[PDB]
């Protein structure tokens, strides 16, 4: 009944890979899409303008870092979070509850919401589904995330089932609190941890609600890669095909390609930024460790196929010297490049899907990444074989 925000351009015959279009209030976004953090909280980070120049048409943004106390913040801006960020394209804004429960061990979770006491004076801050959705309505982001009860995937016990059912109840609360469904798209977040039955229950129950899209939560928490890819495959097997699948917290290139093969459409991770901080640059063969002296007299670019400004203007040797003379500017250049590599990777994946050659693409990618596609990690081989893709 409700209008679908996603159009399927193509689906490959073997895997679950999909190429599509998100039609959002600030423009169309090609999927599968990696979503960089547009929030400027980092002193060392790429700017919104450079993201626009790279071709990024949707990024992540929250106001958790602003203000006086921890939690999401109203900004009291006439143009909302888009005006605050000077961003003409699409924004995805999480609830802020994940950061509130992860960054502060003092914060506690009750059915009423996420509770915190002031570090300075013990002031009590409560983030309820109602408050989360009201803040997100004021911010005006294009896609807003349900407030959910997040538990560590390493945790086992009744707490997992408790959080799953609480996430369902909070999904209903957020749906009810959500004004402006004509301008913002609320996504549910599938919970259940590594328990197949709990996650299957969460799938069956959450897909009963007519929300524009669905996300897969509680993965990439230190769980085994077997459990990770099995949970992803379960989720996408039971999520509707005419709506987006957003897998939160995965940025490794191999994980991206594999989870595209499993049916995921949207991704996010701060991995490119962290990789840059080690003096490392992402390439089809993995990463170049530019601090090493084998690049001292290497005057080629990071990647002669890369279209990013760093590869247009600077060489490996310049970056190698800059890492040891001005680590910060080198970090900025490597950040630009790694984000451009993530975008270039997603674009090439989508192109391979549209041209009906995705399995050959995966084979080439694994060969370049690991030497020969049969040297691919065992978990990725299992995952790919589960949806009809064999290597070599
Ligand atoms: N709102 C929300 N934001 C998120 N970002 C990343 C996740 C990924 N799941 C995290 C939660 C527990 C697991 O150990 C993993 O570390 C996520 C979520 O599950 N919910
Ligand atoms: Br990023
Ligand atoms: Br040079
Ligand atoms: Cl809704
Ligand atoms: Cl060396
Ligand atoms: K805050
Ligand atoms: Zn580059």
Residue numbers in the entry: 12 to 403
What do the authors of the reporting publication say about this deposited model?
In contrast to the homodimeric architecture of the bacterial and archeal TGT, the eukaryotic, heterodimeric TGT is composed of a catalytically active queuine tRNA-ribosyltransferase subunit 1 (QTRT1) and a catalytically inactive QTRT2 subunit. Here we report the first crystal structure of the human QTRT1, which is the catalytic subunit of a eukaryotic TGT enzyme. Analysis of the human QTRT1 catalytic subunit reveals the enzyme to possess a bended (α/β) barrel, consisting of an eight stranded β-barrel at the core and eight flanking helices. In addition, the protein contains a Zn2+ binding domain, in which the zinc ion is coordinated by a triangular arrangement of three cysteine residues Cys317, Cys319, and Cys322, while the α-helix bound His248 completes the tetragonal coordination of the metal ion.
Furthermore, we were able to obtain the structure of human QTRT1 in complex with queuine. Therefore, we chose to soak the ligand into apo crystals. In addition, the excess electron density map localizes at the site which is equivalent to the preQ1 binding site in the bacterial TGT enzyme. The exocyclic oxygen forms contacts with the polypeptide mainchain at residue Gly229, thus completing the coordination of the 7-deaza-purine. We also did observe density in the mFo-DFc omit map for the additional cyclopentene-cis-diol, a hallmark of this modification, which distinguishes queuine from the bacTGT substrate preQ1. The di-hydroxy-cyclopentene moiety is located in a grove of the protein surface, distant from the QTRT1 catalytic residues and thus also to the anticipated binding site of the RNA substrate. While the space to accommodate the cyclopentene ring is provided by the Gly232 and Gly233 residues, its coordination is achieved by polar contacts of the cyclopentene C5 hydroxy group and Ser164 of the protein chain.
